[PDB]
């Protein structure tokens, strides 16, 4: 399914080239502009453990998920990944534990050493 496709075909968008954050563009966005650190960003997303034991959606409250980019308000893989996206874009990310919740995890919700998968739609981004 979606996670395996990203494993075998996804682009490694880490600085370190450690395959910690892999990305496939599923729908192309508008213009050339991607968000800057500190930009207010607006998304819709679905996410899951790659196990599939826990699943999560902004769609399951009909209201976009909003955060300031590059401030570590979200896991590192999102600050990396959403920074590569254009307004209108839909992307898939597959994320190793080092760029998500690590060896500590986030119990009881996220186990130790969990791999995560997200589908993300970048709706909009606005300056600080
Ligand atoms: C551990 O707590 C939670 C985790 C999650 C889900 C998750 O991992 N994310 C949610 C969207 C942004 C990326 C990432 C994250 O940075 O989340 C921490 C967080 C949430 N709100 N803010 C501002 C930052 C998980 C959920 C299980 C399936 C895999 C993704 C969502 C949470 O609540 C909606 C959450 O509780 C706070």
HEC per residue, 1-18: CHHHHHHHHCEECCCCCC
Residues enclosing ligand 1, CB less than 6 A?
45, 47-49, 54, 56, 65, 67, 73-75, 78, 106, 109-110, 116
| Domain assignments of the chain as residue spans, ordered by start | 1-128
Q: Could you tell me which of 91, 77, 102 has the C-alpha nearest to residue 13?
A: 77
Quickly list DSSP for 31-70: SS--PPTT-EEEEEEEEEETT-S-EEESGGGTS-EEEETT
Q: Which residues does 60 contact at the CB level (< 8 Å), separation at least 6?
A: none
Provide the resolution (angstroms).
2.0
Contact 82, 21 (CB under 8 A): no
Is the CA virtual torsion 63, 105, 115, 82 positive or negative?
positive
DSSP letter at 105 equals: -
List Cα–Cα distances, 73 to 24, 36, 37, 68, 76, in angstroms.
Answer: 23, 15, 12, 7, 9
Contacts of 25 (CB under 8 A, 6+ apart): 89, 90, 91
């Amino acid at each position: 399914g979606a996670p395996a496709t990203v494993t075998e075909q996804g682009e490694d968008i880490t600085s370190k080239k450690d395959r910690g954050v892999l990305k496939i563009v599923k729908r192309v966005g508008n213009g050339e502009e991607t968000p800057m650190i500190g930009d207010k960003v607006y998304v819709h997303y679905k996410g899951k453990l790659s196990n599939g034991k826990k699943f999560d959606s902004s769609h399951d409250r009909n209201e976009p998920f909003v955060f300031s980019l590059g401030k570590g308000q979200v896991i590192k893989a999102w600050d990396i990944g959403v920074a590569t996206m254009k307004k209108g874009e839909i992307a898939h990310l597959l994320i190793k534990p080092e760029y998500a919740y690590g060896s500590a995890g986030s119990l009881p919700k996220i186990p130790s050493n969990a791999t995560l998968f997200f589908e993300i739609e970048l709706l909009d981004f606005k300056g600080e």
